[PDB]
Ligand binder design. Structure first.
Ligand code: HEM
Ligand SMILES: CC(C)(C)[C@](O)(CCc1ccc(Cl)cc1)Cn1cncn1
Length: 530
């Protein structure tokens, strides 16, 4: 009755393990975790309190490749096999996806104690934006940061932003190599070159002021290119690697925030604090409710985050608008007629109020944002075990939840013919969004309490967008002028490109080219240029 004889051979076996040839040990350090991975999934599948987990061969990596390249196609397949709730492994993390409006509710309206946005996001935003703001702070501070920024995002602010944005668009048609409307009546542009440039010029001039705008006319502009380099999700896998690239990022953040603090410290020194910018605004209004004031460094880091977030979502969207309208001359024609009616043949100057009377223009943005949500996935880290109601499921702390209103945007059940671009699906519903009923305030204004709308381009709950009206104002001025000034179409055989999902935002796969021509070949844009 000796099991001792077996316990010796355990020890013996361990000793022989340490004496295998390296060719068999390396092999083992590969085969052991691979074998163990597969048996763990097999066993995991039996738990009834866990959503189905998507099968994967490579440990740690998980479904990263397929998710990273075609997330919506990944979601549709998983949805057919497993339904609306499923998990998948992603570079070391377990992601629990909840699709559809009930997913929007589950994730966007999760209790503050259940999930953390900053725990999912901080490890990219912080190196790009700087410390102490956005996701490098507790949620309550973020809530008030959004409140501060919203104080420069009023109707009265938009009324003064409109002519500023319009002047920038005209200067851009006049001076940019991509246009030069005074010298060329037709031409070809890559919209992934023009829109990011037009977006930074207009957003700077209005949110940052003329000083910062003027900086863009110099080599300073390169720093923004550098800073944006660090805003690619190789940095979620690798937040800090001691290579180059990471260093222009860090350098840019320091140099750009330095430029903002310089301006800030000079205004306060010269008593020059008015009501022009987001900068004036945060200088007058950045004291938290417990009495602590934001530092000049935190104010500048917040400016970087706000400008950069708004940079990428808006430029991607005007790119898609131009790309969809280029094969839809009927929509351009219709948008033009609206321009002629609202602006009295173009003899009325565009104002923020006149923008609100251009429903087809706004529906075109609304529709573009339906087909091309610039953020295909929003994440939280689960902080406390979460029960999914009317199910047996429990999402344990340490998991991540993934919500994807952009996927619902593309479902026929909610938007008939969802892959067809049609601005008329929004007739007499041209509002950028609308609180479908009751409201709640998390610290930056009252917003819809329910988040079950299948159309959720600006998310919802405490992390909801506050840039929506600014985006519509900027995209609206932009497109109003494009429409009244140019017609445009594709080179022969070209069509709307597929999205490049691997980036920060769901940009079109470049180069995405369109051919423009002046509606009025003789029209000249005034003002001086080199
Ligand atoms: C077409 C344009 C835009 C779209 C579709 C969009 C979308 C979104 C979404 C979906 C969220 C929620 C993120 C989450 O739940 O994890 C969000 C948050 C936010 N956005 Fe936007 N956005 C746009 C433009 C802008 C602009 C122009 C700005 C700044 C001027 C901006 C600033 C912000 C800020 C400060 C938050 C809050 C983040 C948080 O509370 O965690 N967005 N946006
Ligand atoms: C830059 C911020 C504001 C923090 C951000 O929320 C970053 C959040 C975020 C960025 C990238 C991916 Cl893949 C997922 C989430 C983006 N944004 C939202 N509206 C406009 N930009």
């Amino acid at each position: 009755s000796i099991v001792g004889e077996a316990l010796e051979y355990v020890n013996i076996g361990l000793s022989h393990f340490l004496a295998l040839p390296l060719a068999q040990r390396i092999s083992l350090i590969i085969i052991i975790p691979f074998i163990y991975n597969i048996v763990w999934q097999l066993l995991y599948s039996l738990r009834k309190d866990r959503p189905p987990l998507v099968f994967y061969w490579i440990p740690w990596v998980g479904s990263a490749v397929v998710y990273g390249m075609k997330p919506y196609e990944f979601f549709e397949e998983c949805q057919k096999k497993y339904g609306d709730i499923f998990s998948f492994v992603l570079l070391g993390r377990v992601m629990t996806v909840y699709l559809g409006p009930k997913g929007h509710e589950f994730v966007f309206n999760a209790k503050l104690a259940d999930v953390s946005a900053e725990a999912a996001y901080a490890h990219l935003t912080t190196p790009v934006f700087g410390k102490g703001v956005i996701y490098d702070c507790p949620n309550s501070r973020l809530m008030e940061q959004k409140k501060f920024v919203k104080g420069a995002l009023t109707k009265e602010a938009f009324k003064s932003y409109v002519p500023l944005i319009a002047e920038e668009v005209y200067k851009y048609f006049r001076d940019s190599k991509n246009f030069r409307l005074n010298e060329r009546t037709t031409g070809t542009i890559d919209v992934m070159v023009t829109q990011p440039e037009m977006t930074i010029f207009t957003a700077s001039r209005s949110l940052l002021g003329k000083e910062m705008r003027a900086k863009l006319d110099t080599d300073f502009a390169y720093l923004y290119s550098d800073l944006d380099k660090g805003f690619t999700p190789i940095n979620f896998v690798f937040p800090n690697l001691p290579l180059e690239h990471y260093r222009k990022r860090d350098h840019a953040q320091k140099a750009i925030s330095g430029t903002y603090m310089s301006l800030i410290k000079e205004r306060r020194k010269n008593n020059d604090i008015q009501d022009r910018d987001l900068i004036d605004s945060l200088m007058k209004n950045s004291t938290y409710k417990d009495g602590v004031k934001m530092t000049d460094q935190e104010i500048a880091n917040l400016l970087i985050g706000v400008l950069m977030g708004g940079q990428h979502t808006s430029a991607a969207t005007s790119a898609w608008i131009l790309l969809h309208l280029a094969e839809r001359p009927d929509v351009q024609q219709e948008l033009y007629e609206e321009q002629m009616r609202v602006l009295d043949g173009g003899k009325k100057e565009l104002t923020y109020d006149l923008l609100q009377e251009m429903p087809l223009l706004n529906q075109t943005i609304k529709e573009t944002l339906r087909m091309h949500h610039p953020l295909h996935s929003l994440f939280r880290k689960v902080m406390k075990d979460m029960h999914v109601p009317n199910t047996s499921y429990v999402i344990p702390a340490g998991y991540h939840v993934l919500v994807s209103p952009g996927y619902t945007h593309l479902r026929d059940e909610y938007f008939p013919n969802a892959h067809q671009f049609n601005i008329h699906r929004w007739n007499n519903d041209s509002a950028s969004s609308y609180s479908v009923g009751e409201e709640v305030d998390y610290g930056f204004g009252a917003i819809s309490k329910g988040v079950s709308s299948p159309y959720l381009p600006f998310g919802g709950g405490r992390h909801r967008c506050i840039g929506e009206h600014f985006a519509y104002c900027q995209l609206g001025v932009l497109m109003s002028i494009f429409i009244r000034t140019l017609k445009w179409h594709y080179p022969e055989g070209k069509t709307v490109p597929p999205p490049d999902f691997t980036s920060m935002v769901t940009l079109p796969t470049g180069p995405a080219k369109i051919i423009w021509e002046k509606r009025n070949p003789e029209q000249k844009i005034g003002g001086r240029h080199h």
